[PDB]
Symmetry: D2
Subunit: 295 residues, 4 copies
C-alpha cells in the first residue's frame, strides 16, 4: 500500500483496425503517461474498455502494463467483473504481475444485497494476496446506489486501502473524508476535480488525464499554495476539453487526440462504440496541437 | 413450424457444488420443461446466469439444450453481450446448433447512442444468418431507456421477428401492439402476465415458468375462452409464488424448488449470489410439494 | 349504488376568456357526464386544475357540482392540498355540501415522513365528519413513492374507504387487491383501464371519461361478460384518443373536444398551461364528431 | 449596487396555533441582519410558503420589508404553480420595495419548456422592473432542465440571477463559463465552498439563519486564498447540517433559534410534525455553541 495517494490516469486500451489489442500503442501510451509525470495508472477499468474484453484479454493488458511501468509509477489493477470467481482470477494475476493494488467496481446488472457486495470484495481481497483493494463507487454506470453507511462499511473492510469515488455528490465526499481522515479518496469525475479536492478528495483517477494529466497535478499544486484563481482557470480549461469529449464520445475522442499526438496508431473503440463523427475532427486535431505545444 | 408466439421458459443454468455446469441437471431441467407443456425455451439470458458465465460456457449450454430439445419445442438463444463481436460469435454458434431464433439484450454499462444500438442488432442479425432476432427491452436491469419511437425502429429492422418486453408499462405494450399488429410480443414480467396479454402481448418469456409453466399456459387458455375468473385466479396464484421468490431471491429460490422436485442436484447460483436463507426453506419445500401435486 | 365502486369522471373546470370559472359550462359538463351514464364525479383533483385554483375557488366548484348532481350520481370531493389545515377546510365544506366521500393526494413538494402522511390523512378524515376518505396515490405527479406496506397502512386507517391508484404497476394493483378483497380500488391511468380491472381494480377515475365515459363502462361490462375481445377493442379506441390528447395537452384537448360538443364555451386551461396548438384543431373537431355519432 | 452575496432563506415563525408569529418574524429578520447577512430570500421553500395562502405570503413580505428595506438586500420568492397567483405576489413585492423577485419552476403538473418561459415572462411583467431570480431546484420541483434550457431562462429579458439548488458542480462551472457576469447563488449549503470554487458567487440557504457568519467566513477565506480555513468552516457547517437532516431541517433550525431567544414557538405547519424530543439536548447544545462562537 506504499502511498496510493495521487493523480492517476485511467488507462485506455488501444486496438488495431480489426479490434484486437495493439500492443505497441499500449506500451507507447504507458510511456507517454510516465513521460508526462503521472503518479500512476488505473488499468482495466471502464476506460480501458474492460467490459468489452475477455478475461484473458484483460490479463494480457495488465501484464504488458506491468512490464512497462512496474517500479516507475504506481499501478492499480481494476479486476472487477460481475462474477466473483472471474474477479478473483484477475486479482491473482495482478498479484503475479507486481501491481501495487487491485480495485473492483460494485458488481452490476443483477441486483445483489449489500452483504453480497461485501462478500464479493472480501473474496477478491483474499485472492489479491496482500495487494490493497480500492473500492470503486460509480452509481451512474453500475446502477448500484450505496448509502453513506454502506460506503463506510466497505471502506473499513480488512484489506481496503482506498475509495475511487465516481460521484458528483460533494456533500457525500465531505462526509466520507470526515468519517475517514486518513483514507486515500480519489475524485472520479474529472470535470469537478478542483471542487472534489476542496470537499475532501486527496487525489483523482480519470480518463482525461491521459492527455492533460499535468493540468490536474497543477490544480493540486494551486490549491496547496492557496492560488484559487489558477486552480479555477485550470479546471475551466479541463472542462472546455471535457465538454468536447462528451460531444465526441470520451474514450474515442481521447484516443483520437492521442492518435494525432502519434501515440495511438488506430483511434477506435470496440463495437458497439462507433467511430468519431468526422465533423469533430477539426476540433480534435486543434486540441492535440494545443496540448502538444503546452506540455 | 416457424411460429415464435407462445409461453417460453427462461431457462436456469444448474451448477454443481464447485459452481461448474451440472450437465445432468441441465438436461433434466430441459426435459422437465418439455414435460410440462412449455412452447419453447429462452436460453442464455439473465435467468441462465449468462452474465457470470464465459462465452464458452454459454456455448456449452446452448449446445446441450439443442441436443435435448431441438425439434421438440422452440429454442431461442440469447446471444447478447456488451461486446458486439462476442455476441456475433454466440449468434453463429446458435445457428450451427439449430436454434430457431436469437436474441440480445441492449448492451449495457457503457451508454451507447441509439444508432450504436441499432448497428449492434444489425451486426448480430448478420451473424445469425437467417435466425430471426428477438429484441430484448429490460430497462430495469440494463439501464437503457428506449422511447416508443426507438422501440418501433428496432423492431422494424430487417431480420427482427419479435420483442421480449420486460416492462411493466402496459400503455406502451398496447401502443407496440397497435403499431405492429403482426409482431411476436412476449410479456417479460411474470407477475403481470394476464394483464400484459390483455394489453396486447401474445405470449411470454419468464423465469418462473420453469416451475409452473402450465399455469401461464392456463392463463392463455382462460383468456382465449373468456374465462376471466380462471385467468385472475391463476395469475393470483402465480403472484403468491412470485412474492415468495422475490423475498428468497428469484433464481436461487427457483433452483431450490427444482431441487425439491428432483430436477436440480445442487441449487446454487454463482457468486456473488449467496445461498437461500434457511428461514425460507419451509415455504420453498411446501411450494415444491404443492406444485408436484398440481402437475 | 350503496357503495363507492364504479366509473367516475375526474371533472374538468371550465373557465371563461378571463380564466375565471364559467359556471354555465361547469353545470353543462356535470349534466353531460350524468347523461353519459357515469357513476359519479371526482371533483377538485388534478383534472379540475385544483392546483392552480385558490381554496375558495375549489370550494365554489364543489358547491355548484353538488347543486347539480347530489342525489343523482356519486360525488367525491378531492380536498387535498399540501397544507393539512387547508385540506381540512375543504373537507368540512364537502361535508356541508353533501358529498359522498373526500379524497386527498399525498402532500407534495416538501418531503414528509410516512408518519406525517398518515397524520395528514387522519386530520382530514376528522374534518370530513363521517365522509369516507379515498387515499390518492399518484407518484408521477406528487413525487411521493410509497411502498406496498405503506399503502396497506394507509388504506386501513380508520375512516378510509377506497384507494385511487394512479400507478401503472399492475403487480402492485394485484397485491393490493389480494391484501384487501373488499377495498374500492379505482384504476387511475385511463390508458391501462382494461388491464387494471383484470389485475384487481373494481372501477376507475379518469380525465378522459368526460368525453367517452360510456367506453369505460363498456369495458367493465365486457369483462363482466367474459367478452375479452370487446374489452380489448374498446381499450384500443380509448388509447387512440389518449395518444392524441397527450400530443395536444390532455386537459386542454379534452376541453376543446367538449367545446366542439357544445358543452364548454371557452376551452382554456389556466396559465401556465398554454392554448392548444391550432394545428391540432381539425383532429380534435373530427374526434368530437366521431364521439357524438358513436353515442 | 448588485445582488451578489450570502442571503439567508428566511424561516416563518408560527405561534402555537400555527398562525404567523409577527414578533418572532421581526426578531428573526433583525437577528439575520446582526449576523452580517447580505440579504434575505423571503417566501421560498424555507418560509413554508407552500403551506401558506397568498395573503399570508404577502403579509410576511410586507413585514420583512418594514424591518429590513434599506438595510440589506431583499428578494421576494413569489412563485406558485399558478402564473396569475405568482403575478399577484410579484406586484406586491414591487409595492413593498423589494430588490428582486424569484420563482421556482411551476411544479406538480408537467409544463413544456415554452410554458415555463412564458410563466417567468409574465411574472417579470408584473414585477414591474424588479429583476427575476430563476430558481432551479429539481429535487423538490421535479422539473429537470437541460443546460441549454437553463441558459435560455437566465437570458430572458428581466432576469438577473439564478438560484442553483443542484449539487452538479460541473453544471455550476458550465453556467459560470457561459454567463461570466451572472449572479449565481449556490443553493445546497453543504457544498457551499465547492460551489463557490466551481463558479457560484454567493449563496442562498436555510442554515444561514443560525450560522450565516460561517458562510461569510468561507467567502472571505476563499477570496484570501486560505483553503484550509474555508474547508474547516465548511466541515463545521456540515456537522450542523448532518444534525438538522436527522431532526428535520426547518423545525430543527426553528428549535435552535428558540434556544437563541429569537423564535417563541418552534413549530412548522402541518403536515410537518414536531422535533423528536430525543434531539433536544443536541439542538440546545448547538444553540449554546453558536452563541459562544458568535
Amino acid at each position: 500500500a506504499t502511498n496510493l495517494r495521487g493523480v492517476m490516469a485511467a488507462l485506455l486500451t488501444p486496438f488495431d483496425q480489426q479490434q484486437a489489442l495493439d500492443k505497441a500503442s499500449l506500451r507507447r501510451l504507458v510511456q507517454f503517461n510516465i513521460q508526462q509525470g503521472i503518479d500512476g495508472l488505473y488499468v482495466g477499468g471502464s476506460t480501458g474498455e474492460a467490459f468489452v474484453q475477455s478475461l484473458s484479454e484483460r490479463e494480457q493488458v495488465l501484464e504488458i502494463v506491468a512490464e512497462e511501468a512496474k517500479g516507475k509509477i504506481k499501478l492499480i489493477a481494476h479486476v472487477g467483473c460481475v462474477s466473483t470467481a472471474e474477479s478473483q482470477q484477475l486479482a491473482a494475476s495482478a498479484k503475479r504481475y507486481g501491481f501495487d493494488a487491485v480495485s473492483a467496481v460494485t458488481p452490476f446488472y443483477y441486483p445483489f444485497s449489500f452483504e453480497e457486495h461485501c462478500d464479493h470484495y472480501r473474496a477478491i481481497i483474499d485472492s489479491a494476496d496482500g495487494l490493497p483493494m480500492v473500492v470503486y463507487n460509480i452509481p451512474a454506470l453500475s446502477g448500484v446506489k450505496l448509502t453513506l453507511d454502506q460506503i463506510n462499511t466497505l471502506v473499513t473492510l480488512p484489506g481496503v486501502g482506498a475509495l475511487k469515488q465516481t460521484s458528483g455528490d460533494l456533500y457525500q465526499m465531505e462526509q466520507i473524508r470526515r468519517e475517514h481522515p486518513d483514507l486515500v479518496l480519489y475524485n472520479g469525475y474529472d470535470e469537478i476535480f478542483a471542487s472534489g479536492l476542496l470537499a475532501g478528495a486527496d487525489g483523482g483517477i480519470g480518463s482525461t488525464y491521459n492527455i492533460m494529466g499535468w493540468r490536474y497535478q497543477g490544480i493540486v499544486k494551486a490549491l496547496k499554495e492557496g492560488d484559487i484563481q489558477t486552480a479555477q482557470k485550470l479546471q475551466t480549461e479541463c472542462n472546455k476539453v471535457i465538454d468536447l469529449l462528451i460531444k465526441t464520445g470520451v474514450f474515442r475522442g481521447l484516443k483520437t487526440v492521442l492518435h494525432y499526438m502519434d501515440v495511438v496508431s488506430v483511434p477506435l473503440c470496440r463495437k458497439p462504440f462507433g467511430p468519431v463523427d468526422e465533423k469533430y475532427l477539426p476540433e480534435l486535431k486543434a486540441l492535440a496541437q494545443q496540448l502538444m505545444q503546452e506540455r
